[PDB]
Design an enzyme around this catalytic site. Sequence first.
Site, short mmCIF file in Angstrom:
data_model
loop_
_atom_site.label_atom_id
_atom_site.label_comp_id
_atom_site.label_asym_id
_atom_site.label_seq_id
_atom_site.Cartn_x
_atom_site.Cartn_y
_atom_site.Cartn_z
N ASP A 21 0.79 -1.22 0.00
CA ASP A 21 0.00 0.00 0.00
C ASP A 21 0.82 1.27 0.00
O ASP A 21 0.24 2.36 0.15
CB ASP A 21 -0.96 0.06 1.20
CG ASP A 21 -2.14 -0.84 1.03
OD1 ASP A 21 -2.61 -0.97 -0.12
OD2 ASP A 21 -2.55 -1.45 2.03
N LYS A 24 3.59 1.29 -4.85
CA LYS A 24 4.47 0.68 -5.85
C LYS A 24 3.75 0.55 -7.17
O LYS A 24 4.31 0.86 -8.23
CB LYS A 24 4.92 -0.73 -5.39
CG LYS A 24 5.83 -0.77 -4.17
CD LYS A 24 6.23 -2.21 -3.85
CE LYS A 24 5.02 -3.06 -3.53
NZ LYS A 24 4.30 -2.53 -2.34
N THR A 25 2.55 0.02 -7.14
CA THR A 25 1.82 -0.19 -8.38
C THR A 25 1.38 1.12 -8.97
O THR A 25 1.43 1.30 -10.19
CB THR A 25 0.62 -1.08 -8.10
OG1 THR A 25 1.11 -2.33 -7.60
CG2 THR A 25 -0.15 -1.37 -9.35
N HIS A 84 3.92 -9.08 -0.49
CA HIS A 84 5.26 -9.27 0.05
C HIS A 84 5.85 -10.62 -0.37
O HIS A 84 7.03 -10.71 -0.73
CB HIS A 84 5.18 -9.13 1.56
CG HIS A 84 6.49 -9.33 2.24
ND1 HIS A 84 7.53 -8.44 2.09
CD2 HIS A 84 6.91 -10.28 3.10
CE1 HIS A 84 8.56 -8.86 2.81
NE2 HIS A 84 8.21 -9.98 3.44
N1 LIG Z 1 -3.03 10.07 -1.48
C1 LIG Z 1 -2.30 9.21 -2.20
N2 LIG Z 1 -2.69 7.94 -2.31
C2 LIG Z 1 -1.84 7.21 -3.06
C3 LIG Z 1 -0.68 7.62 -3.69
N3 LIG Z 1 -0.10 6.56 -4.37
C4 LIG Z 1 -0.89 5.55 -4.14
N4 LIG Z 1 -1.95 5.87 -3.34
C5 LIG Z 1 -3.03 4.98 -2.94
O1 LIG Z 1 -2.55 4.06 -1.99
C6 LIG Z 1 -3.12 2.75 -2.22
C7 LIG Z 1 -2.01 1.75 -2.40
O2 LIG Z 1 -1.27 2.09 -3.59
P1 LIG Z 1 -0.70 0.87 -4.44
O3 LIG Z 1 0.03 1.40 -5.63
O4 LIG Z 1 -1.77 -0.13 -4.65
O5 LIG Z 1 0.35 0.28 -3.40
P2 LIG Z 1 1.31 -0.98 -3.46
O6 LIG Z 1 0.65 -2.06 -2.68
O7 LIG Z 1 2.60 -0.54 -2.86
O8 LIG Z 1 1.43 -1.32 -4.91
C8 LIG Z 1 -4.06 2.89 -3.43
O9 LIG Z 1 -5.41 3.03 -3.03
C9 LIG Z 1 -3.54 4.16 -4.12
O10 LIG Z 1 -4.52 4.88 -4.82
C10 LIG Z 1 -0.27 8.97 -3.58
O11 LIG Z 1 0.72 9.50 -4.07
N5 LIG Z 1 -1.17 9.70 -2.80
MG LIG Z 2 0.91 -3.21 -5.85
#
Ligand SMILES: Nc1nc2c(ncn2[C@@H]2O[C@H](COP(=O)(O)OP(=O)(O)O)[C@@H](O)[C@H]2O)c(=O)[nH]1
Ligand SMILES: [Mg+2]
Length: 408
Positions: A21, A24-25, A84
């Site tokens: 979260d 990354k994606t 993870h």
């Molecule tokens: N406010 C905010 N939310 C973000 C940002 N980047 C990602 N998110 C949110 O955080 C959540 C997790 O992002 P995601 O890319 O799925 O995370 P991952 O699990 O690391 O791949 C999602 O609901 C995204 O929309 C950002 O720069 N700002």
């Molecule tokens: Mg992801």
Amino acid sequence: ARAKFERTKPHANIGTIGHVDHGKTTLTAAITTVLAKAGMAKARAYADIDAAPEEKARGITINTAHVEYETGNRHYAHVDSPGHADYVKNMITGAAQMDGAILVVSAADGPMPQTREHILLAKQVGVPNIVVFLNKEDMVDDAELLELVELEVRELLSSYDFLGDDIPIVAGSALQALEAIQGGASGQKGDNPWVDKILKLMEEVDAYIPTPEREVDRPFLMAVEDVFTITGRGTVATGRIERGSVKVGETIEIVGLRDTRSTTVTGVEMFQKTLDEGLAGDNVGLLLRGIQKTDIERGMVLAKPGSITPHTKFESEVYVLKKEEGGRHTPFFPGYRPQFYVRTTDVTGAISDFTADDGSAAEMVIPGDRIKMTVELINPIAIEQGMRFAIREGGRTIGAGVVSKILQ
Ligand SMILES: Nc1nc2c(ncn2[C@@H]2O[C@H](COP(=O)(O)OP(=O)(O)O)[C@@H](O)[C@H]2O)c(=O)[nH]1
Ligand SMILES: [Mg+2]
């Protein structure tokens, strides 16, 4: 005078790493989307990348999205995984090469346990370099707070022997950049500050993560797969050249299982081709002067002399497969003596000295978990840092390892 014309832009393999979260994606989507404005990528949407497909390989199942794009400087294969466990499996098994990694750290949360663990694994599997994207900057109204997270991340990187003072850290919002593109931003620098930060990230990746040496320029290595007696002059050892190159007349070493021995390559053959030189990736038969078939056997490798040495004992990062993924339901334990599949053959070994990430001793490692442990093999075999191996019981892979440190 004139530089040599490069027919193809350099290539590098990277991936986004960091805690679940943290973005990354979203960052991956934003990169492809910003770079697609330049014509340098297929714009890939979040929901696309976030739904990463399963891949199978040598008995390991991993969920992983693969995107491609280029900057003005370099072509990139970019990996991103949902959870993870996928990162542990990809990094340990080596199913996605990483010449460098983008560590995505949520500014609103700071580094989290998987932040630490992905840096740990990055160190242990030999990821050369990291660039940090401090994401979710839109959620932190406070420059003093951003600095503290950045210092904490640098301290964290430095504690795993990355150069914390040199690693570029770009703060931004993957989400705001993507929304800015969707709302009409051009992708030109200066047009939108959120997009500028993505462009800034990629400039840092271009500058800071090195292009890997070409495999054919690395020292020759070929695992011996089959051997053949055709005339009295020597044996033909066959295999796929893993790296480097070999020429007729060169001295190579035969390494592992027997005392290291030097021999001259007096022929290189491929199907319908007598060659003067075999190249990395080529499946070749190499005529080895004066070697008898009895002197040579699978497990052994052919190598540029001194480029790799036989060892019996080493530290490694080991992943234990879940039963769901073809492993056993029972943990690995000190003094367990499974088979170690090293390039071509099973070698008997004993595991020991289980070391938890905090450095304390562990009594076991359960399936689905990862730990640092020591392997001692019953016979010496060519071992180098970053060599992967499978741990096997009755021919079924039950774990996966990567050599992290040669002990003997
Ligand atoms: N406010 C905010 N939310 C973000 C940002 N980047 C990602 N998110 C949110 O955080 C959540 C997790 O992002 P995601 O890319 O799925 O995370 P991952 O699990 O690391 O791949 C999602 O609901 C995204 O929309 C950002 O720069 N700002
Ligand atoms: Mg992801």
